[PDB]
Amino acid sequence: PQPLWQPDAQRIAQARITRFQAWAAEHHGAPAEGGYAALHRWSVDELDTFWKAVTEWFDVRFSTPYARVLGDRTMPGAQWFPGATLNYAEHALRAAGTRPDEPALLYVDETHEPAPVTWAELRRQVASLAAELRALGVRPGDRVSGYLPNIPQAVVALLATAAVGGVWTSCAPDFGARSVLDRFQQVEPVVLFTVDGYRYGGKEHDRRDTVAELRRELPTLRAVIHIPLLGTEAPDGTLDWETLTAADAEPVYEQVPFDHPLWVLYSSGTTGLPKAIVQSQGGILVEHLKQLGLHCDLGPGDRFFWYTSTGWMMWNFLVSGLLTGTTIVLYDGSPGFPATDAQWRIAERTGATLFGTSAAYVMACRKAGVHPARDLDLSAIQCVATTGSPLPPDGFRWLHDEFAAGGADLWIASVSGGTDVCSCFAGAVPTLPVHIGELQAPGLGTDLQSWDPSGDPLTDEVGELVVTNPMPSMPIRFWNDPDGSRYHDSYFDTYPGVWRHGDWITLTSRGSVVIHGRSDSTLNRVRMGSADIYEAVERLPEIRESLVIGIEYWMPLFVHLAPGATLDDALLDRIKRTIRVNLSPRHVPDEVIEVPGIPHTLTGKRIEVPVKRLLQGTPLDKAVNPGSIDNLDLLHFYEELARKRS
Ligand SMILES: [Ca+2]
Ligand SMILES: [Ca+2]
């Protein structure tokens, strides 16, 4: 297997993860030799010592000592650092004591004119707001909610919430009221931070009526804090943001147990109410430190820009950049406004050193004839990362060569972040080569395996992604989950005591990971992942997006066509051809059906399972939570299809 890219030996030697291994080998019995393969095996075989090592390396300061690193090891509900106390916000703001006048936040909107908030100023605003939250009666454990775009106020609010031991939960303001309420009503927040609207694509999006509706339908709220993004007056009964952040009193951080809830995230699952996933201050603290400082190589003074809505877990990951003393870049706006290269212009104007984006955006830039490294000053960029669908080899080459032609050797990273543990089970390692369509390795401390139906491990064979050991950022539990039934059914109902993620994967002999698709959405004719098929079909110019389903056996391919394209015999021939060639005859659809579009979750994930149910005759009204999908009418198309075929 020929790598797309191999890191040079000095880059390897200079990686923080390499320094960590050397230090761990001196002080904690880690292997000095053997590189990542050896470090990883140690991180799993000596799990307690590994996490101890992580906390020392990052100087996590427990205000009360832990009794041990790990008590009960069984899942779900493993017992991390029992006895210890800490505070996430306190750790995040440590750099205010070391480089107070450096920028902690660089924020920007569609004017593309960045503004800084210094570490000292961030610490002060957070302390002011935390004191106000305490005065409003927010106690440790109370939920504090936000209806907020990616603006510096959202970071200040989250940190202030964590500082008081409040439990953060948020939605972005492109969510409609039913989607927001389906989430927030489950956890009964006592505070709401909210904007009056936002700007996107050069257009104004008023949210005053939505805010009025949220307030009326959330009767547990006791205080509402208004952020006048569009410059409107605070509604009756609300507090004005600027009045709460202006004080200069001593920072105070609530020292909470390791397991104390930090935030509630919401699953993208489309059945029933969205799962309300609770993660701990301690678990997120150590896992995000590990990912950011070791897997992403981030440290003090770096500048981390991920293009993201606050409604995606990548925002939470971005916020945690502060934990490593890293400046974070916040952009509230469209990815292509005023022009296609907008995200690159932000990276330029903020001096980003790590720029995280989507493979789709990279490909769209290449297609549009953008040359970002040539035309902008991207000399500060050391790494470009994508999460979600993998960057194809022509995209990787373009990106790398675009920087390489100008004398820069770029690290192109592929990660796979998920809401469930607010991190990745597998993804990037700065010291390993990159291969087509692979995630480089399971993360440190993650015992990832591919299991057959009998629960035995496979190598170079497709199987179920399992994680056989506990990770600190795994959910404490789901909120609004009697008996813990939904949490159990989500991961623990297939192999006892083992986390089964629902991904159909290969774990290669080189220790890397290929994700073929969702296990519950495979095509069985031999069990095939749908991802492989989407890659092939969707390379065709005429096909904007596709969706493949298999039902007991009928295997139709739904295609949303590019403008001007027509589903003719020639097109059907090209479709079937590219499939039987690049994959196999088994992969060829029984039928191709043109569609007005492809329905998605709110986060833009394909919804194969709900569509399958519809095609199986389940009425739309009972198949999905409509607040959890992006286009009701598009989904109704598929119900009509089943009705027509009934
Ligand atoms: Ca347990
Ligand atoms: Ca295409």
Cα 74 to ligand 1 centre (Å): 4
Cα 206 to ligand 2 centre (Å): 34
- Map tokens 């990832």 to a residue: 448
Type and span of the H or E element at 117: strand 115-118
Is there a contact between 105 and 117 (Cβ–Cβ < 8 Å)?
yes
Task: Tell me how far apart the alpha carbons of residues 590 and 596 are, in angstroms, rounded to a whole number.
Answer: 20
Cα 153 to ligand 1 centre (Å): 37
Is 468 exposed, middle or buried (CB count within 10 Å of its CB: 0-12, 13-18, 19+)?
middle
Residue 512 structure tokens: 């890397």
Residue 331 structure tokens: 């952009």
The DSSP letter of residue 500 is E
Task: Tell me how far apart the alpha carbons of residues 387 and 391 are, in angstroms, rounded to a whole number.
Answer: 9
Cα separation values, 445 from 44, 441, 476, Å? 5, 11, 18
Dihedral angle of Cα 213, 219, 225, 229, to the nearest 10 degrees: -10
Which residues, other chains included, contact 497 with Cβ-Cβ below 8 Å and sequence gap of 6+? Answer: 74, 75
- Map tokens 């951080």 to a residue: 253
Is there a contact between 217 and 185 (Cβ–Cβ < 8 Å)?
yes
Cα separation values, 547 from 33, 361, 550, 608, Å? 46, 20, 10, 7
Is there a contact between 276 and 188 (Cβ–Cβ < 8 Å)?
no
Type and span of the H or E element at 322: none
Is there a contact between 265 and 271 (Cβ–Cβ < 8 Å)?
no
Nearest CA to 286 out of 142, 97, 422 is that of 422
Ligand nearest to the CA of 476: 1
Is there a contact between 117 and 152 (Cβ–Cβ < 8 Å)?
yes
Strand partners, 206: 197
Ligand nearest to the CA of 79: 1
Nearest CA to 429 out of 448, 419, 415 is that of 415
Report, in angstroms and rounded to the nearest whole number, the Rg of the chain calculated over CA atoms.
24
Is there a contact between 268 and 628 (Cβ–Cβ < 8 Å)?
yes
Report CA 291 to chain centroid distance, whole Å. 12
Is there a contact between 467 and 448 (Cβ–Cβ < 8 Å)?
yes
Task: Tell me how far apart the alpha carbons of residues 350 and 639 are, in angstroms, rounded to a whole number.
Answer: 47
Residues in the chain: 646
Cα 229 to ligand 2 centre (Å): 37
DSSP per residue, 370-381 = --HHHHS--TT-
Long-range own/partner contacts, residues 248-251 (CB < 8 A, 24 or more apart): 248/124, 248/127, 248/128, 249/127, 249/128, 249/131, 250/127, 251/90, 251/93, 251/123, 251/126, 251/127, 251/130, 251/163
Nearest CA to 133 out of 104, 165, 105 is that of 165
- Amino acid (one-letter) located at 402: E
Peptide bond before 338: cis, by omega within 30 degrees of 0?
Answer: yes
Task: Collect residues with CB below 5 Å from ion ligand 2.
Answer: 543
Q: What angle (nearest 5°) sits at the alpha carbon of residue 502, between those of residues 439 and 268?
A: 95
Task: Tell me how far apart the alpha carbons of residues 478 and 185 are, in angstroms, rounded to a whole number.
Answer: 14
Cα 422 to ligand 1 centre (Å): 20
Helices (H), 136-238: 152-163, 177-184, 208-217
Helix, strand, or coil here: 515?
A: strand
The DSSP letter of residue 551 is B
The DSSP letter of residue 59 is T
Ligand nearest to the CA of 578: 2
Cα 517 to ligand 1 centre (Å): 29
Residue 174 structure tokens: 């492109």
Q: What residue ranges define each of the domains in the chain, with the CATH number in brackets?
A: 85-503 (3.40.50.12780), 518-645 (3.30.300.30)
Nearest CA to 330 out of 149, 200, 126, 99 is that of 149
Cα separation values, 216 from 105, 181, 210, 219, 224, Å? 34, 11, 10, 6, 12
Task: Tell me how far apart the alpha carbons of residues 223 and 134 are, in angstroms, rounded to a whole number.
Answer: 12
Query: Which sign does the torsion angle of CA 138, 141, 147, 153 carry?
Result: positive
Nearest CA to 148 out of 260, 235, 224 is that of 224
Q: What angle (nearest 5°) sits at the alpha carbon of residue 325, between those of residues 140 and 60?
A: 55
Residue 313 structure tokens: 């877990």
The DSSP letter of residue 293 is I
Task: Tell me how far apart the alpha carbons of residues 544 and 537 are, in angstroms, rounded to a whole number.
Answer: 10
Task: Tell me how far apart the alpha carbons of residues 285 and 574 are, in angstroms, rounded to a whole number.
Answer: 50
Q: Which residues of 158-179 are buried (b: 16+ CB within 10 A; e: fewer)?
A: bbbbbbbbbbbbbbbbebebeb
- Amino acid (one-letter) located at 571: L
Query: Which sign does the torsion angle of CA 566, 567, 569, 573 carry?
Result: positive
Task: Tell me how far apart the alpha carbons of residues 224 and 218 are, in angstroms, rounded to a whole number.
Answer: 11
Is there a contact between 146 and 157 (Cβ–Cβ < 8 Å)?
yes
Helices (H), 320-466: 342-349, 359-367, 372-375, 393-404
Helices (H), 290-327: 313-319
Residue 208 structure tokens: 């005053």
DSSP per residue, 63-103 = SB--S-SBS---SSS--BSTT-EE-HHHHHTGGGGTSTTSE
Task: Tell me how far apart the alpha carbons of residues 334 and 299 are, in angstroms, rounded to a whole number.
Answer: 28
Task: Tell me how far apart the alpha carbons of residues 24 and 622 are, in angstroms, rounded to a whole number.
Answer: 54
Q: What angle (nearest 5°) sits at the alpha carbon of residue 528, between those of residues 275 and 578?
A: 120
Neighbours of 145 (CB within 10 A): 30
Cα 72 to ligand 1 centre (Å): 6
Task: Tell me how far apart the alpha carbons of residues 96 and 173 are, in angstroms, rounded to a whole number.
Answer: 30
Residue 134 structure tokens: 């305490």
Ligand nearest to the CA of 72: 1
Nearest CA to 178 out of 273, 311, 275, 278 is that of 273
- Amino acid (one-letter) located at 520: D
Cα separation values, 305 from 196, 336, 343, 380, Å? 25, 16, 9, 12
DSSP per residue, 555-601 = -EEEEEEPTT----HHHHHHHHHHHHHHT-GGGS-SEEEE-S---BB
Cα separation values, 3 from 126, 295, 427, 510, Å? 46, 19, 16, 12
State this model's resolution in angstroms: 1.9
Experimental technique for the deposited model: X-ray
Strand partners, 264: 278
- Map tokens 């194969």 to a residue: 608
Strand 523-524 to 591-594 pairing: unpaired
Q: Dihedrals φ, ψ of 640, to 5°?
A: -60, -40
Cα 275 to ligand 1 centre (Å): 20
Helix axes 35-45, 47-57, angle to 10 degrees: 110
Cα 83 to ligand 1 centre (Å): 17
Strand partners, 191: 144, 223
Cα 488 to ligand 1 centre (Å): 12
Helix axes 152-163, 119-135, angle to 10 degrees: 60
Task: Tell me how far apart the alpha carbons of residues 646 and 33 are, in angstroms, rounded to a whole number.
Answer: 63
Report CA 443 to chain centroid distance, whole Å. 15
Question: Longest C-alpha distance within the chain, in Å?
Answer: 73
Cα 23 to ligand 2 centre (Å): 48
Ligand nearest to the CA of 538: 2
Is there a contact between 592 and 147 (Cβ–Cβ < 8 Å)?
no
Task: Tell me how far apart the alpha carbons of residues 498 and 209 are, in angstroms, rounded to a whole number.
Answer: 46
Q: Which residues of 308-333 are buried (b: 16+ CB within 10 A; e: fewer)?
A: bbbbbbbbbbbbbbbbbbbbbbbbbb
Cα 78 to ligand 1 centre (Å): 5
Ligand nearest to the CA of 534: 2
Q: What angle (nearest 5°) sits at the alpha carbon of residue 550, between those of residues 545 and 556?
A: 50
Residue 489 structure tokens: 């059914």
Cα separation values, 504 from 448, 451, 514, 531, Å? 13, 9, 9, 10
Cα separation values, 464 from 414, 441, 515, Å? 21, 16, 10
Nearest CA to 443 out of 296, 547, 325, 345 is that of 296
Cα 533 to ligand 1 centre (Å): 39
The DSSP letter of residue 646 is -
Task: Tell me how far apart the alpha carbons of residues 103 and 115 are, in angstroms, rounded to a whole number.
Answer: 9
Q: What angle (nearest 5°) sits at the alpha carbon of residue 588, between those of residues 585 and 594?
A: 165
Task: Tell me how far apart the alpha carbons of residues 379 and 372 are, in angstroms, rounded to a whole number.
Answer: 11
Share of the chain residues as helix, strand and coil, in percent rounded to the nearest 5: 35, 25, 40
Q: What angle (nearest 5°) sits at the alpha carbon of residue 314, between those of residues 308 and 318?
A: 90
Ligand nearest to the CA of 544: 2
Cα 470 to ligand 1 centre (Å): 9
Cα separation values, 270 from 267, 573, 626, 629, Å? 8, 34, 8, 7
Cα 504 to ligand 1 centre (Å): 26
Report CA 92 to chain centroid distance, whole Å. 19
Helix, strand, or coil here: 39?
A: helix
Task: Tell me how far apart the alpha carbons of residues 263 and 169 are, in angstroms, rounded to a whole number.
Answer: 6
Cα 385 to ligand 2 centre (Å): 22
Q: Dihedrals φ, ψ of 296, to 5°?
A: -100, -5
Ligand nearest to the CA of 70: 1
Cα 416 to ligand 1 centre (Å): 26
